[PDB]
Amino acid sequence: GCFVFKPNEDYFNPEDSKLRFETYQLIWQQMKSENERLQEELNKNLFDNLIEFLQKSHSGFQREIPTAALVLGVNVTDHDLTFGSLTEALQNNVTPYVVSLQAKDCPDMKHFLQKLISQLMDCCVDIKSQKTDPKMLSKKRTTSSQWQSPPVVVILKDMESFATKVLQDFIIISSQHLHEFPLILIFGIATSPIIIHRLLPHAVSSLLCIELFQSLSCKEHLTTVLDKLLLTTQFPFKINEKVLQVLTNIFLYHDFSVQNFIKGLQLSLLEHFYSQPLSVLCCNLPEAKRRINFLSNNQCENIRRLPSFRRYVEKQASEKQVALLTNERYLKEETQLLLENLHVYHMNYFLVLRCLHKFTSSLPKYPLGRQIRELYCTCLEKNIWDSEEYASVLQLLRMLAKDELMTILEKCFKVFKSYCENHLGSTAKRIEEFLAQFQSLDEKFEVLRENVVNFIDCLVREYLLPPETQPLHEVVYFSAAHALREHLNAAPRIALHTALNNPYYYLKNEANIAPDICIAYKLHLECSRLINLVDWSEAFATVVTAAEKMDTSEEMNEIIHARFIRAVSELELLGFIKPTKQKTDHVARLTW
Amino acid sequence: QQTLRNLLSKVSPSFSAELKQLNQQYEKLFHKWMLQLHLGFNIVLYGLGSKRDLLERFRTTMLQDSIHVVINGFFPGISVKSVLNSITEEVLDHMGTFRSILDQLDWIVNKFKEDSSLELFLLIHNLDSQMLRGEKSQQIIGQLSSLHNIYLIASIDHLNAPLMWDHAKQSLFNWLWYETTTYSPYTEETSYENSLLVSLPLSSLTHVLRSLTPNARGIFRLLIKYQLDNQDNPSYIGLSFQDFYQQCREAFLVNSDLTLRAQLTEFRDHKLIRTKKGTDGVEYLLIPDNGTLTDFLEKEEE
Amino acid sequence: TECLSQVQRILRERFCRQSPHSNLFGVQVQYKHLSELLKRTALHGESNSVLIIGPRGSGKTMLINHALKELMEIEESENVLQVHLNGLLQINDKIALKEITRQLNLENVVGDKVFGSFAENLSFLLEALKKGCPVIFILDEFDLFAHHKNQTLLYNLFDISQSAQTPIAVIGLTCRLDILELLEKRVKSRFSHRQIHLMNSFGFPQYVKIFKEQLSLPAEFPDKVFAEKWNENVQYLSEDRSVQEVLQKHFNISKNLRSLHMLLMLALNRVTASHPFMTAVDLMEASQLCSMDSKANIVHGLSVLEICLIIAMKHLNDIYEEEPFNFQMVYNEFQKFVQRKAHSVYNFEKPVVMKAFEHLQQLELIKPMEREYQLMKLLLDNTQIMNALQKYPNCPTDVRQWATSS
Amino acid sequence: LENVVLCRESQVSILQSLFGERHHFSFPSIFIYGHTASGKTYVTQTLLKTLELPHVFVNCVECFTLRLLLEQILNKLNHLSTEITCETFNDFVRLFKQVTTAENLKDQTVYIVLDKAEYLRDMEANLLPGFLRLQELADRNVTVLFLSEIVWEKFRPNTGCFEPFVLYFPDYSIGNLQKILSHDHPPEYSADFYAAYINILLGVFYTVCRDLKELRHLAVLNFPKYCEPVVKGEDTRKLWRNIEPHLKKAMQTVSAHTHVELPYYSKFILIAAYLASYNPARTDKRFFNHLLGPKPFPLDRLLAILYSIVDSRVAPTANIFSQITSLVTLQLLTLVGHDDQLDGPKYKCTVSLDFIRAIARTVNFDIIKYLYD
Ligand SMILES: Nc1ncnc2c1ncn2[C@@H]1O[C@H](COP(=O)(O)OP(=O)(O)OP(=O)(O)O)[C@@H](O)[C@H]1O
Ligand SMILES: Nc1ncnc2c1ncn2[C@@H]1O[C@H](COP(=O)(O)OP(=O)(O)OP(=O)(O)O)[C@@H](O)[C@H]1O
């Protein structure tokens, strides 16, 4: 029924769309490029052990076949990126004969060999510059007679979803003649190396050489990409703690993946750039000073009339209120230093937030935050010194005053001694202010009183709630949790329950008027054990007999039955009652 | 069916104004779908009422310029072969390969990477049904729609509808999930499926017959003959898989165990073979009457 | 000498290639029934289509080629154009048409159009043959031929044999008994019935004669003294009652007259190095190398962990009978046996015990009907295992006490 | 290649006699069973290498389709050109008559050796009785020499065939396993001493595996470890009693850690799927043998026991259903109604109990009296 019609760009829709959309394209494309680099840097300790292992097991060929079973995590969403990086590294420092098999394009053996030799054929024909089995060996015999006869490796991506028949037959084929064609397969085990015993029976498992590798356990992957992507001063678009709380919850509870997290941040940035007319100036500070100075006056009335600025109006005096209220030429002057104060709060916030992260990660049992993620959460949900948790840190930090605390004051100081002039100008020159406190660390009371002035100065000066403290903070903060959460992760099994039980949209229907289908389901589950058909037709007939008389019986039985059968085919169709075959009839209560 | 459906829409759906208004809430949300679909996402939208007329009003207001392959999924003709066939001829303007589903899948992937700004996007009514889904079937929709140049919109109706998406298969098309309700009765599904008040006739068996290999046609000859030849024995509880494997192997119709198991599960899709577990735990096979099974292969050979 | 290589060359061909030896015994009435039918179908235009059924290994192909040779010897080469088919090779219709094209020398005329109606195809083959004329169709191994998709090269041959009246014999050679009941009803009602043979064996005291007439050096003379010496040695071996003892033992397992060829084939392979006239004990060991127990050689060689596991599976029939078991009940019975025993040599730990299973599955003693603790099936007998555990050469005393407990 | 026999001489000699010289006929087909250890291609390759009977060798492990098994047989045979193509079997018997009409093998009994024929068993129903009659199907002095893992009794087509001559290559006996497990090539010791090492190792070790290949592997490992204290310390009895303390642990040790980090709802999902698989005889009502295995159970029951296990803030989002499908691709849960529909079939548990104990204990939960007792 798939009828095709033949036909025979910057459209976004005040917030004028052309520089809005180029601002979008710049920010999101920048974030994605630095996302891919800070993926590829972390895995270097892992796979540059792998180049050593594959080099050693190739070079000693003068009975065996080498496997390196990777243990990648449970996130199948980002398993393409590590194999892209590993294909790059193995292609550069070892052979340009690297192929990969997907376990969905080869159910049985003919597809396996036909896709493998085609990938090998294009891979050899590019960097030199077919259903047959032994001709693959003849390809390796032709194509590389020289250069230490480089070992062609296959990358099985999923070890798990391969059937055992086709994989067993390939390992016995390849291990049968590896005299010419040395093959070092590397299957990526999704779970743990236990299941390579399960999926391979013992003869084929005895045939090969197993050497396993770890992979980056996933929480200390997303601490790096959360820490680098949003916690920095550098990227112009920050995020609210509630929207971040929604995003980092569905990571750690359901999904356990990072590509879903970057989709979540992508959707937040897009919806922010749609939502509000002050979002256009999400830039670095001179790029903000570019067109704060020239702009439409109704958007500057919007920069007056958004609620956080009108709080700033509420806290200020009349003689500049009368001119800064309406006139553009001064409203630029106060809002420019407000955006500079925004960048100031960000810059003196995040550096000493990292300082407090080191100084609290040093602690035994770590009561405030387990990790660098959740420190953002605890200093924004409740007010931090109001809450009992930083009360517990301050109650902990007194009698912890020993050389462990002084040694880690030295060590935390050293890692933000590298961040002393990587901050490079603090917004209070807090680097040499706090370092001027922190320079008497080499020369037991002094750690206590230095601690006192350090945390009080730090936390009470800048570390506070960003919305109320800072006007014009709408521009960099996007906050809508249960508008986004239903877009990203919805629930149809709760939606049908709500709109079938309580189908009240706005006239009287909340606890008989405006269904047919909710009448059918609600009356089905007024008799809540199971059901047969005819009595259910009489019961539905009874309640719409009530509907007819609260506004001949045989015509009314016909129209009631017709609209009944239109209702009951839907109530089968939508995953409730599943038809009870060969009996006289019934319907079966399949969902309670 | 027909004289029951004469009485349909006689007088009085018991609200009209809020139904026009609750559908008129969603017309403001369309330019968001156009922008959100240009960036590489895919909208699924679920619901309680009929939203396929909303998608039709959507394609009328904003798809007068682009190609759209409106794949209905409610009537029992469509499985993903017809998708790939119709997209290959009536979109790419030349016919494609014929050897296998994966060959035309990889081939129809291959045309889009080289031809920039071709800008085709299909939309699917009722992506979850008895016929559309399946791990052979839904992945071809997935792998097809993963690209930058194909943007599917769907509608899932079922209660257990996101049970057919494991994480890997979910990350082929980037889903974001709208919420919609319309309360309109689903007149196309309820029309073209069935009505109980009046087994499968000859037409869908002709369609499965004409979309499959002649060896699969030779296979169901064997199964329908072993059924018809023992129709009035109440102890005949169906062939096992191994008996059917050896009696299909002796007639050279298929080579391996896995090919016959794949043929069996794709013919278990159409509801013309039912597995029964006996007390062995081995599941024998019997299909849903006898006189309607004589007519085909009476007429399939004179 | 001349004798040993010449006797082994002349006896080995009729012995194990089933070559055409001229003596045929037990089949004189069936052959004589065939010859006049073949002479009147071959000499005149009319076409009658006899059918032959018997067991595997006896009769058929020898009879039809012997009668074919004797009928070919008569001239007016008579232009009977014989067309040998086999059921094994030509599986489908499209191979069958081009195979009839190959046998009948048709590719002088190109005929390069696949026609729709295959009766026109077969009629064209017979038509261009007819203008160019008898055919004799020897359709061997008909039981595989009765599984065509559409039964074309069964049926159109019968329709042409009644309708075209070009000289034809559709001589089917079958092996399974129900050639009629398996044949589909339009063909079987159409023209399957011409007069059906049945083929069987005969009595043992004449079957010792067919041993002597098989084994005796022929009327072909390698060297006539050596033929007299050896065929007299065949008769002297034949009259001895131990050869008659082993031959009666061979009758009651095998009425086949093909098993006799192999049974004697190993004997004559033993003979040429020394003592060219051989013993009854040499025929006894020649029978003895033909095994009785195919599964005792599999079970006799297995190490004793597989032995106490296989007798644990046998013990799993003798309590809680008739389920296809899994690994865990097998492990439980093995552990309760080893905890009945005092010594700790054979309390082998769990991951080794899986290796015995995935080696024993490759011998297909155990059968799969979820991955490694499920529903495994045993296809075996008690008594072969009970015989095998006493013939195990290094069988320990504890697995012997397991066997006696059982 | 070196030693043809290593004392299996009688089976070698009856097979060697049976071939005969070249100009006369031999058997049509010979079937050789045996265990996988027993030299069934070592003996026949070093037998066929000596006389050079002009032969073709195949594994049918390699040839997964019928066309390759015919193609390599014909292509390897015509060397003793282009790929002489055969799509079908009757093409093979046709091109066979032209190929075996050369002076190298016109009279010589060509052997088409077929190895590991149990993989040929499930190729087709045509090819096995089509190959057993090759001596008179094509009539060109052929002998198709089978060898296999599997007994002939299962291998028969159940119509019947040309019954081949069947040899049993014997398993290696105990003193024969002393002799042929490398009594030749000990490099630096006396052969008495390497046989003294392995004569001690074997008699301990002749109850787990009589496979010659892996025992050659284990002996070429634990002999140089045995060797080193003789040539460093210096008396076979003392280091016999030193070598068995290492041999027991090397026996036992020829699987890093069972624990896998999981997202927290998938932990509670497969906790619930275990708890609804292992004691489920409608004992839902109580809380809120074992040996036979996992009983299947429907999805809605799993969802109910999920709600009872977790803190009650769960909603059936798309992610908790999509995760419950995605546990099955990692083979931690299995669907046993294979096609019963997309609507929730029986999902049975397929992880071992120790793994479940660790998954339950890493989120605050002790469950064994809760699981089956
Ligand atoms: N009555 C007989 N006279 C002579 N030889 C016989 C007789 N019966 C059996 N044989 C021998 O037994 C074997 C029979 O082979 P043939 O192919 O003719 O029959 P078959 O083996 O039953 O046919 P198929 O190949 O269909 O099983 C041949 O060795 C033949 O020499
Ligand atoms: N008598 C022997 N002397 C020396 N080595 C032997 C002997 N018998 C077997 N081997 C070993 O066995 C190997 C040959 O394996 P074998 O001949 O057992 O394969 P196979 O029996 O065909 O295998 P399968 O039965 O699994 O197909 C040789 O490489 C050698 O290492």
Author numbering:
A (entry chain C): 9 to 16, 27 to 31, 37 to 85, 98 to 164, 193 to 506, 548 to 615, 625 to 664, 669 to 709
B (entry chain B): 269 to 466, 471 to 560, 562 to 575
C (entry chain D): 14 to 89, 91 to 146, 152 to 388, 396 to 432
D (entry chain E): 4 to 83, 91 to 244, 249 to 268, 295 to 328, 349 to 433
The article reads:
ORC1 and ORC6 co-purified with ORC2 were in much lower amount when compared with other ORC subunits. With these general similarities, however, ORC2-WHD displays a very different conformation from all previously reported structures. The most significant contribution to this interface appears to be from the helix-turn-helix (HTH) motif (α3 and α4) of ORC2-WHD. The loop region of this HTH is positioned very close to the cleft between AAA+ domains of ORC4 and ORC5 with its Phe524 docked into a hydrophobic pocket formed by the residues from ORC4-RecA (Ile105, Leu163, His166) and ORC5-RecA (Ala135, Asn136). In addition, Arg521 and Asn527 of ORC2 form hydrogen bonds with Asp132 and Glu134 of ORC5, respectively. Moreover, most of the DNA binding motifs of ORC subunits, such as the initiation-specific motif (ISM) from RecA subdomain and the β-hairpin motif from WHD, are blocked by these interactions. In contrast, although DmORC structure also assumes an autoinhibited conformation, its central channel is not fully occupied by ORC2-WHD, leaving a hollow ring with a diameter of 10–14 Å.
